[PDB]
């Protein structure tokens, strides 16, 4: 009858864009509820613009806070909307606090929850993302798993097979809908040329990496060392959480002092795809960037002790180095010489359309 998409953050907007593209080709009555978990223009507005997405019908203006504060406000405010609008399906993507809050509200209202990117596991169930995803999976009526590994994760937790659909990851659709747009846009090319030929691309924002000063210090030390050993320039797109933490721990001024590191504010998706595509290698703790690196055939080094997309490591596209600078140094050598051929485990880029078809039929 009626579908509500609930989203809050940069990666959700990007990964829901192919679902929105598919919904636009149907007669389905649907709208977006934005929690405004993310609110800075370069974390939010820019994606609605570049991805040609409609304005949310509801903006809850929750923003930042501690987990209980933020999630609690979300339960209160999302419920007010769902009690009024009464959709019969709620769609949430991924593993943010917005996802959990949307699913929890819907489940108690007896509204079917469709979870896009279901079944991913790092088995670091101490991570807030792992908590969010596990809990959401257990109250979902449709579990859209990106891979057979994810499906098997769900089966091992006793979830009924008829709820699970292996549809690929919508990030393939997004990277495939937008890379050629980025490549053929003169403004995007001009941005790229203003910022950049040999470089490593870095993003870092996991709570467990940037909220912990000695882990953050270790990673910064590691980056300084990569630069000296390999004589490589680094382009660092800096998440606002990470900027705040770097300043809190007095590490920010040391990065800006390093003339081989170019620090840039968060950029739009088209701009970022260009930075990824052209990087000699990608260093990250982002979930989506691990996937994009794999899709774009650019070697990835993941600054985490584990990942919830192990298929990237399994196919040879990615290597985990955590906090450890020696592991990081060795990984750079390995990946610098790595042939950029590997399988893509995440599907053929029509996941959004498949998800909408499944929800249409039920």
Ligand X SMILES: O=c1ccn([C@@H]2O[C@H](COP(=O)(O)OP(=O)(O)O)[C@@H](O)[C@H]2O)c(=O)[nH]1
The set of catalytic residues is: 205
- Which of 300, 268, 271, 307 lies closest to 284 in space, CA to CA? 300
Pick one of ligand UD1, ligand X, its own copies, none as the site partner of residue 244 (Cβ within 5 to 8 A by kind). Answer: ligand UD1
* Comparison of 222 and 287: residue with beta carbon closer to ligand X: 287
| Binding of residue 134 to its own copies (CB under 8 A) | yes
Minimum CB separation of residue 75 from ligand X in Å reads: 21
User: At closest approach, how far in Å is the CB of 171 from ligand X?
Assistant: 6
Tokens matching residue 95: 């593993």
To the nearest whole angstrom, how small is the minimum distance from the Cβ of residue 243 to ligand X? Answer: 12
Which residues, numbered 78-117, are part of the site for its own copies (CB under 8 A)?
Answer: 78-80, 82-83, 104-105, 107-110
**Stretch 19-38 residues interacting with ligand UD1 (CB under 6 A):** 37-38
Binding mask 76-105 for ligand UD1 (x = CB under 6 A): -------------------xxx--------
Sketch the per residue contact string, 20 through 59, with its own copies: x for CB under 8 A, - otherwise.
----------------------------------------
CA 73 to CA 77: how far, in whole Å? 6
Stretch that binds ligand X, among 25-33, 107-115, 265-273, 338-346 (CB under 6 A): 265-273
68 binds, among ligand X, ligand UD1, its own copies, none (CB under 5 to 8 A by kind): its own copies
Please name the residues in contact with 329: beta carbons below 8 A apart, sequence gap of 6 or more: 222, 225, 226, 229
Q: How many residues bind ligand UD1 (CB under 6 A)?
A: 19
- Residues 124-153 binding ligand UD1 (CB under 6 A) are 128-129
Q: If you ran DSSP here, which 8-state letter would residue 244 be given?
A: H
Q: Which is nearer to ligand UD1, 132 or 356 (CB)?
A: 132
Of the candidate residues 237, 242, 344, 351, the single one contacting ligand X (CB under 6 A): 237
For residue 306, what are the CA distances in angstroms to 19, 80, 210, 272, 321? Answer: 29, 38, 16, 24, 9
Least distance (Å) from its own copies to the CB of residue 122? 14
Sheet containing 233-237, strands listed edge to edge, beginning at the edge strand earlier in sequence: 261-264, 233-237, 199-203, 281-284, 300-302, 318-320
Q: How far is the CB of 17 from ligand X (least distance, A)?
A: 10
User: Which is nearer to its own copies, 27 or 66 (by Cβ)?
Assistant: 66
Q: Which segment (18-26, 148-156, 240-248, 327-335) binds ligand UD1 by CB under 6 A?
A: 240-248
171 binds its own copies (CB under 8 A): no
Span interacting with its own copies, options 123-131, 169-177, 288-296, 316-324, rule CB under 8 A? 123-131
Residues within the interface to ligand UD1 (CB under 6 A): 9-11, 37-40, 43, 64, 95-97, 128-129, 205, 239-241, 244
């Amino acid at each position: 009858m009626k579908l509500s998409i609930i989203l809050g953050t940069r990666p959700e907007i990007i990964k829901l864009s192919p679902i929105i593209r598919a919904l636009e080709k149907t007669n389905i009555d649907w709208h977006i509820i934005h929690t405004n978990q993310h609110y800075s223009e370069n974390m939010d507005k820019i994606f609605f613009e570049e991805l040609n997405l409609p304005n949310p019908k509801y903006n809850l203006n929750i923003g930042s806070g501690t987990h209980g504060e933020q999630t609690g406000k979300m339960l209160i405010e999302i419920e007010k909307v769902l009690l009024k609008e009464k959709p019969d399906v709620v769609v949430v993507q991924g593993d943010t606090n917005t996802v959990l809050a949307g699913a929890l509200v819907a489940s108690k209202l007896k509204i079917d929850v469709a979870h896009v990117e279901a079944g991913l596991r790092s088995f670091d169930r101490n991570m807030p993302e792992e908590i969010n995803r596990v809990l959401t999976d257990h109250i979902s009526s449709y579990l859209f798993a990106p891979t057979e590994i994810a499906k098997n994760n769900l089966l091992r937790e006793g979830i009924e097979e008829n709820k699970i659909f292996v549809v690929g990851n919508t990030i393939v659709d997004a990277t495939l809908q937008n890379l050629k747009i980025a490549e053929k846009n003169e403004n995007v090319r001009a941005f790229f040329n203003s910022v950049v030929d040999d470089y490593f691309l870095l993003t870092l924002h996991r709570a467990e990496n940037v909220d912990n000063k000695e882990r953050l210090k270790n990673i910064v030390e590691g980056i300084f060392e990569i630069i000296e050993i390999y004589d490589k320039a680094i382009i660092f797109s800096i998440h606002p959480r990470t900027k705040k933490r770097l300043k809190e721990f007095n590490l920010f001024d040391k990065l800006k002092s390093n003339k081989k590191i170019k620090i840039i504010e968060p950029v739009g998706y088209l701009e970022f795809l260009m930075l990824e595509k052209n990087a000699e290698l990608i260093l990250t703790d982002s979930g989506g960037v691990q996937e994009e690196a794999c899709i774009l055939k650019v070697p990835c080094i993941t600054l985490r002790d584990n990942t919830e997309r192990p298929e990237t490591v399994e196919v040879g596209a990615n290597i985990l180095v955590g906090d450890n600078k020696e592991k990081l140094i060795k990984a750079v050598e390995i990946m610098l010489n790595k042939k950029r051929n590997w399988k893509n485990p995440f599907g053929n880029g029509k996941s959004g359309e498949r998800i909408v078809r499944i929800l249409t039929y039920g």
